[PDB]
Write an enzyme that holds these catalytic residues in place. Structure first.
Site, short mmCIF file in Angstrom:
data_model
loop_
_atom_site.label_atom_id
_atom_site.label_comp_id
_atom_site.label_asym_id
_atom_site.label_seq_id
_atom_site.Cartn_x
_atom_site.Cartn_y
_atom_site.Cartn_z
N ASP A 181 61.15 -14.00 -14.43
CA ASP A 181 61.00 -13.61 -15.85
C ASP A 181 59.55 -13.84 -16.30
O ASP A 181 59.08 -13.09 -17.21
CB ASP A 181 61.94 -14.39 -16.78
CG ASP A 181 63.32 -13.77 -16.98
OD1 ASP A 181 63.67 -12.85 -16.22
OD2 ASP A 181 64.03 -14.21 -17.92
N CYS A 215 60.65 -0.18 -12.79
CA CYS A 215 60.88 -1.53 -13.35
C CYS A 215 61.28 -1.33 -14.80
O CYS A 215 62.06 -0.40 -15.04
CB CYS A 215 59.64 -2.40 -13.08
SG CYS A 215 58.04 -1.64 -13.51
N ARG A 221 55.28 -4.02 -11.90
CA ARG A 221 55.94 -4.28 -10.59
C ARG A 221 55.96 -3.00 -9.75
O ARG A 221 55.73 -3.05 -8.51
CB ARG A 221 57.35 -4.84 -10.74
CG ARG A 221 57.38 -6.14 -11.54
CD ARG A 221 58.78 -6.59 -11.87
NE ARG A 221 58.79 -7.58 -12.93
CZ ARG A 221 59.91 -8.07 -13.50
NH1 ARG A 221 61.10 -7.66 -13.10
NH2 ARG A 221 59.81 -8.98 -14.47
N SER A 222 56.29 -1.88 -10.38
CA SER A 222 56.33 -0.55 -9.70
C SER A 222 54.96 -0.23 -9.09
O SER A 222 54.90 0.31 -7.93
CB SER A 222 56.74 0.53 -10.70
OG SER A 222 58.10 0.41 -11.11
N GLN A 262 49.65 -4.36 -14.46
CA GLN A 262 49.61 -4.67 -15.93
C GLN A 262 48.82 -5.96 -16.25
O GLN A 262 48.44 -6.12 -17.46
CB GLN A 262 51.04 -4.87 -16.45
CG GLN A 262 51.74 -3.56 -16.76
CD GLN A 262 53.13 -3.79 -17.33
OE1 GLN A 262 54.03 -4.28 -16.64
NE2 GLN A 262 53.29 -3.49 -18.60
#
Ligand SMILES: CCc1ccc(C(=O)NCc2cnn(C)c2)s1
Length: 284
Positions: A181, A215, A221-222, A262
């Site tokens: 998380d 994601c 994450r992608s 990101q």
């Protein structure tokens, strides 16, 4: 410059934030006019994450062809990926229409349905064999065939039926379930092995349509998944594997979808994955 040395030099100098901002500054800016049409407001999860017009995936319908999804085409590596947001309650039918139309074999999911106490994407696949899902807006049926639950990821076999023609296909769902998380994983081992399992399946291979990767926003994450895969494939293909420049590969990928990677921590994790992937594969 050998990326392992570039890595230690950035780490010792603590300049990750400075490298990351340089990428953000040099990244491509292309129009996203279709994404911003008022008829498409409920098809976008995040106001600041849109597919470019030149690389967007078009749905094969005359009504509204729009989905928040981009084709990333890596010419030298000979790999293609579709990167998309986690489906919304009103776009689950569009999502499976795209999988069908693009002839994808695999869907790669890098998030949980709930994280940080909030919903990050719709429950878009069936959880029980005997309770199939029908998408009436796109005329598709989806059935759970089998489920293999492991410590770091789950693989599912799904049957997608085009109710219009009664054709069926087997879709493999690769679900990475242990991304934290907060932050990025401490070691990149479970991640790099997950990618190995996707590769083994044939889902990334040129005899199929592009893999669908998501994601929550389809950029962070992608981004990490496709950047690591492409960089390791280029290290296999080239006479000089030390020539692979991860910052230049990431800028090439950002010509096709905005915002890939990101945070400065996701950039560092991508370096670690490629290095550890490299040192592990080179000879083994
Ligand atoms: C430090 C321990 C590691 C775990 C995973 C690593 C990786 O990068 N790829 C996995 C893998 C399996 N088989 N092939 C060909 C690759 S490195």
């Amino acid at each position: 410059m050998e990326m392992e040395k570039e890595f230690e030099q950035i780490d010792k100098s603590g300049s990750w934030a400075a490298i990351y901002q340089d990428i953000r500054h040099e990244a491509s800016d292309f129009p996203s006019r279709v994404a911003k049409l008022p008829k498409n407001k409920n098809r976008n999860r995040y106001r600041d994450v849109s597919p470019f017009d030149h690389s967007r995936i078009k749905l094969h319908q005359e009504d509204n062809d729009y989905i928040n999804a981009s084709l990333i085409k890596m010419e030298e590596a000979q790999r293609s990926y579709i990167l998309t947001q986690g489906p919304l309650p009103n776009t689950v039918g569009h999502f499976w229409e795209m999988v069908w139309e693009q002839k994808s074999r695999g869907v790669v999911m890098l998030n949980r349905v709930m994280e940080k106490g909030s919903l990050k994407c719709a429950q878009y696949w069936p959880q029980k064999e005997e309770k199939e899902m029908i998408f009436e807006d796109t005329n598709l049926k989806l059935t759970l065939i089998s489920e293999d639950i492991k410590s770091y990821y789950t693989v599912r076999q799904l049957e997608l039926e085009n109710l219009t023609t009664q054709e069926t296909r087997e879709i493999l769902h690769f679900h990475y379930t242990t991304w934290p998380d907060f932050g990025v994983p401490e070691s990149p081992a479970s991640f790099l092995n997950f990618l190995f399992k996707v590769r083994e399946s044939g889902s990334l291979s040129p005899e199929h349509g592009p893999v669908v990767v998501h994601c929550s926003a389809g950029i962070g994450r992608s981004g990490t998944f496709c950047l690591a895969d492409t960089c390791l494939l280029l290290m296999d293909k080239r006479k000089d594997p030390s020539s692979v420049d991860i910052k230049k590969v990431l800028l090439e990928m950002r010509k096709f979808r905005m915002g890939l990677i990101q945070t400065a921590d996701q950039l560092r994790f991508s370096y670690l994955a490629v290095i550890e992937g490299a040192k592990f594969i080179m000879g083994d």
